[PDB]
């Protein structure tokens, strides 16, 4: 029965120079009997520790600009960011210290919004070198697209695959604000050699229908 | 002005004392807190201690696991973790705060593992007709079955080899990490250059250079 703090949404794409607002919902009332409400917001930048923005509901930590604004009461709390700058990007956590033990929300990632862009899709057979070594990995690449959400599926001889693939996604790109993604299908050499057709099928917002990249061996 | 002790790599069942050096002013005025960040459980408050008198409160969850102490003489804050487990593998922050805020440390990483270091096997992802987008070829290197983090991949040919996408490592069910590093290059360049991914795994003394030829 600890205080759970639920943030929404998970990731928030915004245009730089626009408003952003982030919600943090508390499983209980955080209003202390002294009249303060001990709900705080931090920002964590990649490879750095959390830094305080707003404390006890709506106070600015010293040097925090007022374009960062905290409000709420009871169980609903908001962080509004007013003129989103680049150095504002990263993960925002809420935290309550009203009740012991102090808790943290799961975090909201503030991202850059931009127009859709379809991925370029490429497929890579396993190297002969890897095959000699016993396994067979097939790599499917989705390069430079937006937004992040993407469905990648594997088909071997038209048989949809399950449980033999891992995806990894890059952070948002400096220059063009896109993502890239790797899907890796991992098989044993013997498995790999028994089938001819390997196809990576991709579903994404920026495409009108799914694209399938494939090779025959 | 906070200063946290170095990374720890420890066996399960171990105990480790992490430390946090502050100023003489800090110690007198601020309270000290400890915080845990882990990929499984996110951010967690461990407990707090008032360096003025050594009085301390704890997250019920971390009673028994963590003990907090201060040493005035050296204005240093200590957190003792005992009975360590893989779930304790995390980044641990020391903080100094007040009713109006303060600052957090840079954080000590703790890794709780006895598993063997393993150097990566490095395989080319060759450029072909199926990795070409009208003018450009994509290619890469698959950096597979290593432990622990991190690797570093780098490419050759300077300026045109940026737009590199070295992907986050994925942990496999075998407990070995694996990743890919890919690049897009002008198709013409493949006749006048041979692209090479230079892979360094410090933990295992590995340096590999793999030519990625068509």
């Amino acid at each position: 029965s600890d205080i759970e703090l639920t943030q929404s949404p998970l990731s928030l794409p915004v245009s730089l120079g626009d408003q952003a607002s982030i919600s943090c919902t508390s499983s209980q009332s955080l209003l202390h009997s002294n009249g303060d409400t001990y709900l705080h917001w931090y920002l964590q930048k990649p490879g750095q520790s959390p830094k305080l923005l707003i404390y006890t509901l709506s106070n600015r930590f010293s040097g925090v600009p007022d374009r960062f604004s905290g409000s709420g009461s009871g169980t609903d709390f908001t962080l509004k960011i007013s003129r989103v700058e680049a150095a504002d990007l990263g993960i925002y956590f809420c935290s309550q210290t009203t009740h012991v033990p102090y808790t943290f929300g799961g975090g909201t990632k503030l991202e850059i919004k931009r127009a859709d862009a379809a991925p370029s899709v490429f497929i890579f057979p396993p190297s002969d070198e890897q095959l000699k070594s016993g396994t067979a990995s097939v790599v499917c690449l989705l390069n430079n697209f937006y937004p992040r959400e993407a469905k990648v599926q594997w088909k071997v001889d038209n048989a949809l695959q399950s449980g033999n693939s891992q995806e990894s996604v890059t952070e948002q790109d400096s220059k063009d604000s896109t993502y890239s993604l790797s899907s890796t299908l991992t098989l044993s050499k013997a498995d790999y050699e028994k089938h001819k057709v390997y196809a990576c099928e991709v579903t994404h917002q920026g495409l009108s229908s799914p694209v399938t990249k494939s090779f025959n061996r | 002005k906070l200063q946290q002790s170095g990374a720890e790599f420890v066996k399960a069942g171990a105990s480790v004392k992490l430390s946090c050096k502050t100023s003489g002013y800090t110690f007198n005025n601020y309270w000290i807190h400890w915080v845990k960040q882990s990929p499984g459980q996110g951010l967690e408050w461990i407990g707090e201690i008032d360096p003025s008198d050594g009085y301390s409160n704890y997250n019920q969850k971390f009673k028994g696991k963590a003990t907090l102490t201060v040493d005035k003489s050296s204005s240093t804050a200590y957190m003792h973790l005992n009975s360590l487990t893989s779930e304790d593998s995390a980044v641990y922050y020391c903080t100094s705060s007040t009713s109006v805020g303060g600052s957090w440390g840079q954080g000590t990483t703790v890794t709780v593992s006895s598993a063997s270091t393993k150097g990566p096997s490095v395989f080319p992802l060759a450029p072909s007709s199926k990795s070409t987008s009208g003018g450009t070829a994509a290619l890469g290197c698959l950096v597979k079955d290593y432990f622990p983090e991190p690797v570093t991949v780098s490419w050759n040919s300077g300026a045109l080899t940026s737009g590199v996408h070295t992907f986050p490592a994925v942990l496999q069910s075998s407990g070995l990490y694996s990743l890919s590093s890919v690049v897009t290059v002008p198709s013409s360049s493949l006749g006048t250059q041979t692209y090479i991914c230079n892979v360094n795994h410090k933990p295992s003394n590995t340096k590999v250079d793999k030519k990625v030829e068509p």
Partner: peptide
């Protein structure tokens, strides 16, 4: 015997 404020 609480601490008051942000962590």
């Amino acid at each position: 015997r609480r601490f008051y404020g942000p962590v």
